[PDB]
């Protein structure tokens, strides 16, 4: 999500009455970090190929 | 989050370390360096292999070799003196 927008909870990037998905524990900021450069399949190709 | 990553790689190594401690104490009946090193030249290589593999896996975690060097670069999120 865009960090430059003003959210109520600026750290977790969540507004107050924002609806939550059933699997929000995976899709919040405390969850493991995503990587947006390489798609994960090509990443696995590169790691194992190296 | 970097702190959690560092301490969970720690326990990923410490688990095997306890497995090695349990094996050292099943085999030699003790944990001290004196007895274990006065005898290790008599005990089956398969047992020392299991021991040292586990202790090495713990050392791989803490010493941050290629399999478990994740935490090390993340550990720079703290202050420089640390």
């Amino acid at each position: 999500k865009n960090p430059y927008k003003k959210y109520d909870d600026q750290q977790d990037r969540r507004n107050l009455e924002e609806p939550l998905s059933v699997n929000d524990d995976l899709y919040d900021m405390w969850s493991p970090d995503r990587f947006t450069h390489f798609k994960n399949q090509d990443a696995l190709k590169y790691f194992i190929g190296f | 989050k970097s702190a959690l990553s560092a301490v969970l790689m720690n326990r990923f190594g410490d688990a095997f370390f306890v497995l090695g401690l349990c094996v050292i104490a099943y085999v030699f009946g003790t944990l001290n360096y004196s007895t274990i090193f006065a005898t290790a030249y008599l005990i089956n290589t398969d047992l020392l292999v299991l021991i040292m593999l586990a202790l090495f896996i713990a050392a791989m975690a803490k010493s941050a070799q290629f399999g478990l060097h994740n935490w090390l670069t993340l550990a720079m999120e703290g202050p420089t003196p640390v």
């Binding site: 107050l16 009455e17 924002e18 609806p19 939550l20 059933v22 929000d24 | 099943y26 085999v27 030699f28 009946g29 008599l42 005990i43 089956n44 290589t45 398969d46 047992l47």
Partner: protein, 92 residues
């Protein structure tokens, strides 16, 4: 006679008598619903092709594999103080 409760019973309200403290939480309304759902998932759980996969894995295959491992390796290993050349097993 009209069948009604006795008039000698003097009734009144229930005052548990707690001191109503200030609002130290701001309820959010959506977090609470997410929690109600994750808490009462059991009353809506349905069997499908993924639920069945997970269920049969964790309640048939893994228990059966762990049990095969155990009941093979029951009295096998015994290697306290063993030495070079000596077998660590009690069986073949």
């Amino acid at each position: 006679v009209e069948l009604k409760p006795s008039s000698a019973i003097q009734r009144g309200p229930l005052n548990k008598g707690g001191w109503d403290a200030p609002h130290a939480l701001h309820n959010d309304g959506a977090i609470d619903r997410y929690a109600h759902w994750r808490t009462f998932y059991q009353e809506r759980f349905k069997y499908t092709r993924a639920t069945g996969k997970s269920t049969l894995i964790f309640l048939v295959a893994f228990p059966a594999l762990i049990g095969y491992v155990a009941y093979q390796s029951e009295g096998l290993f015994e290697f306290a103080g063993k030495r070079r050349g000596e077998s660590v097993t009690t069986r073949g």
